[PDB]
């Protein structure tokens, strides 16, 4: 506990008289100051610089759509062979503590670090490097189904007409 | 928690006032004046503890001058001092002034030594 400055008591003490505001003018006056981003009336830095690319128009900002995990973390943790990784078992060992936004998210696996064990992994996506190193080590990659996109019947007829075409052609 | 200033003021003031005893007039009464007067007192005091060291040397030198000038027609403070030094004596000016008043015969002797050797 360091004792506080009490301004305006004596000069011998500390900031006495003026209190360390020097002589007069606007900074030494009582009350709300001037806005923090404001330079004198010269056009402020933040104004004379152009708005950031996407933001500037109202294109929606970029947001993380997966909880990224590398293989580093999976190595460090206490996984014995046969163990199921998934999402749940990474909350269990606490390597991922997801918040609201992250609660609602899926999982993704990114290659970094070299795994040694056979583990059974369940996630909604992998990077290429990831599943390369994983299938190299002898780990079984269970990819989980995303939630179905609702498509009306007509566009099903179209996307199926496609598949019929490819199929009649190859066969 | 409300805090009246209470006695903390009047002690300070009183202790100041004690200083200013025997100042003529309102320098011994009004606190506000007394303050200033205290500072100035302390200040002159400090100044004249320094003046002092100058002043007594002034004095002593003067007395020495008079004490010597009695002897020779041509003799001075300056001449004397110069001779004290080329004779290697250490007596400083307080001592020669005090021996000048309090033991005048002594200073005559000293002068006779200085002359004999300068002869």
């Amino acid at each position: 506990r360091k004792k506080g400055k009490r301004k305006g008591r004596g000069h011998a003490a500390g900031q006495g008289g003026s209190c360390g505001f020097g002589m007069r003018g606007q900074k030494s006056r009582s009350g709300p100051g001037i806005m923090r981003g404001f330079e004198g009336g010269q056009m402020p830095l933040y104004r004379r610089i152009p708005k950031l690319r996407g933001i500037a128009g109202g294109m929606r900002a970029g947001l993380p759509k997966y909880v990224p995990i590398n293989l580093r973390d999976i190595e460090v943790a206490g996984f014995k062979e046969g163990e199921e990784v998934s999402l749940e078992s990474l909350k269990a060992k606490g390597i991922i503590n997801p918040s609201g936004r992250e609660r609602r998210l899926p999982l993704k696996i990114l290659g970094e670090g070299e795994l040694s064990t056979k583990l059974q992994i369940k996630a909604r996506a992998f990077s290429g490097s990831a599943k390369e190193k994983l299938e190299a080590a002898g780990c079984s990659v269970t990819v989980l189904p995303g939630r179905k996109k609702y498509i009306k019947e007509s566009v099903r007829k179209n996307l199926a007409r496609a598949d019929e075409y490819f199929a009649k052609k190859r066969a | 928690t409300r805090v009246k200033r209470g006695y903390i003021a009047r002690r300070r003031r009183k202790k100041i006032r004690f200083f200013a005893s025997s100042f003529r007039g309102a320098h011994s009464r009004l606190t506000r004046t007394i303050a200033q007067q205290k500072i100035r007192a302390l200040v002159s005091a400090h100044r004249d503890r320094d003046r002092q060291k100058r002043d007594f040397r002034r004095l002593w030198i003067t007395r020495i001058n008079a004490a010597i000038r009695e002897r020779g027609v041509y003799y001075n403070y300056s001449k004397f001092i110069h001779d004290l030094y080329k004779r290697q004596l250490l007596l400083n000016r307080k001592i020669l002034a005090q021996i000048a008043i309090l033991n005048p015969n002594c200073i005559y002797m000293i002068y006779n030594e200085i002359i004999k050797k300068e002869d």
Partner: protein, 72 residues
């Protein structure tokens, strides 16, 4: 319900932060009068520059929720 500081929105559409924590901005002057600016210039005015240390104060003071390393 206290009062929490408000992000100055007109500064947060301008500046942002890189992964290592330094502030960056766009460069000024590509919107019009391009024909008469040489292509070399036009390229220079298209990149992202780290904000000049001097301004960091004002910037920082208006974007209290921006995570920023000043390299201490």
């Amino acid at each position: 319900k206290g009062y929490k500081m408000k992000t100055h929105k007109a500064s947060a559409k301008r500046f942002r932060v890189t992964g290592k924590g330094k502030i960056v901005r766009r460069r000024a002057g590509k919107q019009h009068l391009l024909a008469k600016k040489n292509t070399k210039r036009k390229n220079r005015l298209s990149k992202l520059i780290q904000v000049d240390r001097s301004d960091y104060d004002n910037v920082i003071g208006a974007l209290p929720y921006l995570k920023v390393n000043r390299k201490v």
